[PDB]
Amino acid sequence: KMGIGGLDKEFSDIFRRAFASRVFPPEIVEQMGCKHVKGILLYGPPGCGKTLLARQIGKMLNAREPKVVNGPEILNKYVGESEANIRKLFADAEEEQRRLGANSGLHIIIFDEIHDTVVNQLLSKIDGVEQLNNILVIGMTNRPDLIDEALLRPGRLEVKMEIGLPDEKGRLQILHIHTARMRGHQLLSADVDIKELAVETKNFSGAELEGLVRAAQSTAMNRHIDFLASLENDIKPAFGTEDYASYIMNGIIKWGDPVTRVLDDGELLVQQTKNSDRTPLVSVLLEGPPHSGKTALAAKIAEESNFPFIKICSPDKMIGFSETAKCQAMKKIFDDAYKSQLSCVVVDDIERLLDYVPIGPRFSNLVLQALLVLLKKAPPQGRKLLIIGTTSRKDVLQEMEMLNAFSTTIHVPNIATGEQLLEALELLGNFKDKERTTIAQQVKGKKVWIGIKKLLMLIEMSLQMDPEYRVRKFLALLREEG
Amino acid sequence: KMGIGGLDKEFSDIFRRAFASRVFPPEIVEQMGCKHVKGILLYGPPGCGKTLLARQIGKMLNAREPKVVNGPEILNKYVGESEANIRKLFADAEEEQRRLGANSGLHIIIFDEIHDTVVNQLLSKIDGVEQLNNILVIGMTNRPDLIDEALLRPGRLEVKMEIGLPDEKGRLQILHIHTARMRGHQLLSADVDIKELAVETKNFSGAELEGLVRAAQSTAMNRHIEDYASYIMNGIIKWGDPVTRVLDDGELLVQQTKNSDRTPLVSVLLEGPPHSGKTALAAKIAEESNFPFIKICSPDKMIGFSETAKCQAMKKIFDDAYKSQLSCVVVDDIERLLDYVPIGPRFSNLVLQALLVLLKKAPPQGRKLLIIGTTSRKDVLQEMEMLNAFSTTIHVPNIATGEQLLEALELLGNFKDKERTTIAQQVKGKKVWIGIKKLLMLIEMSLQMDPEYRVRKFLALLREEG
Numbered sequence: 034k035m036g037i038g039g040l041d042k043e044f045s046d047i048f049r050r051a052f053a054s055r056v057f058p059p060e061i062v063e064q065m066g067c068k069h070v071k072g073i074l075l076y077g078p079p080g081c082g083k084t085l086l087a088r089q090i091g092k093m094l095n096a097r098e099p100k101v102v103n104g105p106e107i108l109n110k111y112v113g114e115s116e117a118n119i120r121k122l123f124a125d126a127e128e129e130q131r132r133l134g135a136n137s138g139l140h141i142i143i144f145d146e147i148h149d150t151v152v153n154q155l156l157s158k159i160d161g162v163e164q165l166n167n168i169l170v171i172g173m174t175n176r177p178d179l180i181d182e183a184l185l186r187p188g189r190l191e192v193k194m195e196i197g198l199p200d201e202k203g204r205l206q207i208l209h210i211h212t213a214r215m216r217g218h219q220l221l222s223a224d225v226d227i228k229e230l231a232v233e234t235k236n237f238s239g240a241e242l243e244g245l246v247r248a249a250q251s252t253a254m255n256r257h258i259d260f261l262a263s264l265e266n267d268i269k270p271a272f273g274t275e276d277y278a279s280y281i282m283n284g285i286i287k288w289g290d291p292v293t294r295v296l297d298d299g300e301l302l303v304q305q306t307k308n309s310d311r312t313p314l315v316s317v318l319l320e321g322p323p324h325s326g327k328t329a330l331a332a333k334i335a336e337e338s339n340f341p342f343i344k345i346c347s348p349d350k351m352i353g354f355s356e357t358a359k360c361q362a363m364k365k366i367f368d369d370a371y372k373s374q375l376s377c378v379v380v381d382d383i384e385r386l387l388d389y390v391p392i393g394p395r396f397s398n399l400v401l402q403a404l405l406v407l408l409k410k411a412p413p414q415g416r417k418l419l420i421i422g423t424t425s426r427k428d429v430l431q432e433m434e435m436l437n438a439f440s441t442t443i444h445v446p447n448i449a450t451g452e453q454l455l456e457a458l459e460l461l462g463n464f465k466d467k468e469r470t471t472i473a474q475q476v477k478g479k480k481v482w483i484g485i486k487k488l489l490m491l492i493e494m495s496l497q498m499d500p501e502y503r504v505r506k507f508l509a510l511l512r513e514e515g
Numbered sequence: 516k517m518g519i520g521g522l523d524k525e526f527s528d529i530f531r532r533a534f535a536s537r538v539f540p541p542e543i544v545e546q547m548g549c550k551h552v553k554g555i556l557l558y559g560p561p562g563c564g565k566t567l568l569a570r571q572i573g574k575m576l577n578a579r580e581p582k583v584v585n586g587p588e589i590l591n592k593y594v595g596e597s598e599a600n601i602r603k604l605f606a607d608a609e610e611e612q613r614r615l616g617a618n619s620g621l622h623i624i625i626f627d628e629i630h631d632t633v634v635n636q637l638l639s640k641i642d643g644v645e646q647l648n649n650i651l652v653i654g655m656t657n658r659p660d661l662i663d664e665a666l667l668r669p670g671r672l673e674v675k676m677e678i679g680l681p682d683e684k685g686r687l688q689i690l691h692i693h694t695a696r697m698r699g700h701q702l703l704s705a706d707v708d709i710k711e712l713a714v715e716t717k718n719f720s721g722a723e724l725e726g727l728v729r730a731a732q733s734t735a736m737n738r739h740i741e742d743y744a745s746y747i748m749n750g751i752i753k754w755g756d757p758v759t760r761v762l763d764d765g766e767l768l769v770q771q772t773k774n775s776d777r778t779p780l781v782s783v784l785l786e787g788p789p790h791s792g793k794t795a796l797a798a799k800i801a802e803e804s805n806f807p808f809i810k811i812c813s814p815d816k817m818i819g820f821s822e823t824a825k826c827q828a829m830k831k832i833f834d835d836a837y838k839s840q841l842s843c844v845v846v847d848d849i850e851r852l853l854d855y856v857p858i859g860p861r862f863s864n865l866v867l868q869a870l871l872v873l874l875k876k877a878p879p880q881g882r883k884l885l886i887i888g889t890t891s892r893k894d895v896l897q898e899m900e901m902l903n904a905f906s907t908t909i910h911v912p913n914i915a916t917g918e919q920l921l922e923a924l925e926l927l928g929n930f931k932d933k934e935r936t937t938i939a940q941q942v943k944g945k946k947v948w949i950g951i952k953k954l955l956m957l958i959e960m961s962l963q964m965d966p967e968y969r970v971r972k973f974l975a976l977l978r979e980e981g
């Protein structure tokens with residue numbers, strides 16, 4: 034039962050289907066009256082550690098086949114020739130088979146990196162004309178699509194298996210074996226925790242794990258002449274595969290009662306999603322003054338919900354794309370949303386997303402159509418999705434029937450109160466405590482109309498000039514901004 | 516005349532054209548002075564029960580040909596060799612014919628599951644240099660485009676006939692033999708039903724059936740050691756007589772359409788202001804018809820498409836409707852297909868023309884079809900001049916009285932007797948105006964609040980959607 038991290042459900046099924054039909058002795062097969070499977074093929078993303086699995090599986094099936102290995106080129110040697118060779122490794126098995134056919138000979142052949150003559154030659158040997166059973170062949174390849182259709186068909190390669198990147202629990206299994214090997218000998222790093230490593234990594238192919246640990250070992254070697262694992266997390270991948278930290282640079286500071294009302298309302302919306310059998314799709318939008326901080330809030334709502342799949346959609350990625358191309362990427366995101374039973378998606382800068390321009394007005398029809406249809410569009414029954422839109426300008430959106438589409442509308446107004454502004458200032462903690470008092474003295478009797486994004490920028494702008502200057506400059510700046 | 520279910524029309528024409536000119540004895544070919552057809556070709560979709568049909572045709576042509584079977588690979592053995600084989604099977608027919616050429620020998624050869632030298636080699640055998648007539652070869656294949664160019668033209672394979680999309684019945688037959696084998700053995704699965712199995716799968720090739728069976732055997736082995744429903748998940752309430760009345764009027768349109776020859780087409784238009792539930796009502800109308808082919812087209816299916824592509828989809832669906840004797844077609848989000856935007860105006864004209872023209876257009880004689888559309892903006896549509904094109908106008912309205920409201924809350928059964936007792940006490944006598952779906956939404960928006968904040972939140976929502 035060792036060793037292979039994760040892939041136990043998949044392993045159990047695959048194992049059962051290929052091996053069990055062979056294993057039952059001996060009447061069971063005739064009672065079934067079903068011919069033995071010819072081959073099993075596994076296709077995986079690179080770094081999924083296919084080879085070890087194949088050697089192990091082959092080893093597991095027979096005491097000794099004993100294993101046959103084929104070079105990747107396969108058809109090397111021009112004169113005759115290679116075709117004959119492709120015929121030949123099969124040929125040994127078939128010879129054994131003609132010599133003993135009935136019972137009990139098994140040969141294991143594996144093809145790594147699986148046109149003209151070779152397609153037919155292999156296809157002919159694996160199935161037909163007569164017999165050719167009592168042997169199995171496994172092909173390991175990075176891409177399914179590359180491979181030939183004929184093999185795919187039931188028969189010669191009836192079953193094709195796809196290996197997902199290891200699960201967090203699975204990831205824990207792969208890390209767990211290397212860690213365990215390190216565990217058995219006395220030396221270890223106390224700081225490192227298996228659970229912590231597992232929670233930290235979602236994306237990684239197997240390979241990634243052995244690689245990171247090995248690299249950590251190298252850093253440790255360097256040390257001799259968290260810890261090393263933490264350093265590997267810091268660098269090593271290169272993983273190749275949702276950052277909220279890029280959308281909440283600045284904190285959901287509790288500047289105001291409005292912040293709380295919007296968030297509690299967000300909780301009402303997630304709660305609303307949780308069941309929602311009567312209504313499948315959840316649509317929410319945020320309408321705010323520019324520099325509203327609406328997007329920080331939306332990102333925070335997505336983080337708070339923690340639905341199994343939450344993916345941000347970004348305006349920034351769309352830039353410079355053909356309008357049709359913009360639609361295409363967008364649709365692609367939409368289908369990606371489908372897989373989770375419960376799911377959250379973000380629409381940001383919709384005025385920007387649309388490519389809407391105030392003069393004209395001139396705007397992109399196709400993007401608008403994708404947006405318009407999806408809220409009406411229904412995810413398959415069972416699986417569900419919630420939609421969040423951030424809009425700088427409300428009226429235009431109302432105008433394109435977009436408002437009509439959304440289930441709920443929320444407002445996140447700029448603070449109109451000097452004291453709330455003061456509270457926000459305290460939360461940001463930038464200027465000194467004398468300054469806090471002076472600002473507090475100035476705000477009373479005055480009305481403030483400024484966005485938080487704008488506000489952070491304003492504070493920062495006032496700060497660079499010298500201390501006597503900062504109070505006056507900031508007040509004057511506020512006056513101008515007003 | 517047996518056995519092949521359906522495919523009597525295609526069969527009748529095909530048998531006649533290939534077989535009748537040869538069959539007629541004997542002055543007829545000369546009196547006609549027309550050369551016998553070299554071959555007949557059929558191209559078909561997977562799961563069509565092809566092998567049996569080919570067997571039947573070959574059997575039908577001669578008392579005994581007697582049948583020639585060609586292996587799928589055909590050309591196996593590169594070295595000499597294959598070329599000799601491809602030339603050779605033809606060669607035998609040629610030998611018999613040269614030996615007796617004049618009258619009266621016919622040989623039938625069939626190649627299953629269809630370049631360089633072989634292209635020319637086959638063309639040469641089928642036609643020329645001299646004669647090579649008095650034999651026929653039929654090729655049956657899943658995809659048209661793959662096969663060679665030289666062939667299509669009148670002559671070697673002058674007529675190519677395409678079978679209609681595969682009958683389930685055959686699929687049921689191929690499955691039926693394997694199922695029968697399991698029936699035959701004592702062992703069987705209670706859960707498997709021939710009817711269920713046939714109904715779930717459409718696309719699949721023959722091959723696929725025995726394959727599925729192998730998989731079922733494997734599962735047993737493991738043990739020993741176009742949807743109507745999805746579209747309308749909610750189902751339909753009947754709060755008001757108008758609501759019943761639209762279904763009755765719709766049913767009447769269907770009756771008219773199916774029963775009467777005089778109008779090939781009727782156009783069904785639903786007038787509602789969104790968020791109306793009318794789209795659903797239209798789908799329902801289609802369901803009640805029980806028409807042989809009813810297809811509902813969804814904009815999302817067309818989402819992100821270029822104008823031309825949407826139009827092509829429309830053409831495909833509608834053309835699909837033409838082939839059937841009669842059909843019901845439901846059109847949804849008519850504004851969206853149009854891509855009307857109130858600003859502008861911006862809309863796609865080309866689509867407007869395709870739909871509007873087709874709407875006037877009628878299928879070839881002996882067939883009739885029914886078109887149903889959902890429109891947000893009857894006024895805007897009339898402004899286009901498209902509304903005039905539609906045969907009939909039907910209007911579906913949002914609730915207007917407190918009474919329709921409680922009847923709906925009751926039919927849905929979400930709120931308590933108490934809840935409904937408070938709501939009625941807050942609406943009865945007053946005036947309301949809210950579409951059905953938002954209501955179904957607000958309902959969910961109120962169940963999210965605590966058991967005591969539900970009434971207030973509900974009434975708050977209804978206070979906003981005014």
Ligand SMILES: Nc1ncnc2c1ncn2[C@@H]1O[C@H](COP(=O)(O)OP(=O)(O)OP(=O)(O)O)[C@@H](O)[C@H]1O
Pocket residue numbers: 037038039077078079080081082083084085086175199207238239240241242243244
């Ligand atoms: N989940 C995993 N299980 C087992 N081995 C893994 C896993 N992830 C990575 N590996 C590593 O990968 C090796 C075997 O998988 P391998 O990388 O060969 O798969 P692959 O599909 O051939 O990858 P590639 O396509 O990049 O060559 C092992 O040496 C192991 O260290």
Ligand SMILES: Nc1ncnc2c1ncn2[C@@H]1O[C@H](COP(=O)(O)OP(=O)(O)OP(=O)(O)O)[C@@H](O)[C@H]1O
Pocket residue numbers: 281282283284285286322323324325326327328329330331333423425485486487489
């Ligand atoms: N809950 C929160 N949400 C968003 N931003 C917050 C929060 N707490 C603090 N901030 C800070 O407030 C500002 C967020 O404004 P942001 O620019 O993200 O809004 P926006 O939608 O981009 O406005 P606009 O689109 O009009 O530029 C940043 O300084 C951010 O780091």
Ligand SMILES: Nc1ncnc2c1ncn2[C@@H]1O[C@H](COP(=O)(O)OP(=O)(O)OP(=O)(O)O)[C@@H](O)[C@H]1O
Pocket residue numbers: 409747748749750751752753754758788789790791792793794795796889951952955
């Ligand atoms: N009494 C009712 N009549 C019609 N539909 C109802 C009723 N009660 C609930 N529904 C449901 O309300 C939902 C409305 O769905 P649908 O999108 O078809 O409405 P629609 O009018 O097409 O919306 P739109 O106006 O955006 O086109 C469906 O789940 C439908 O089954």
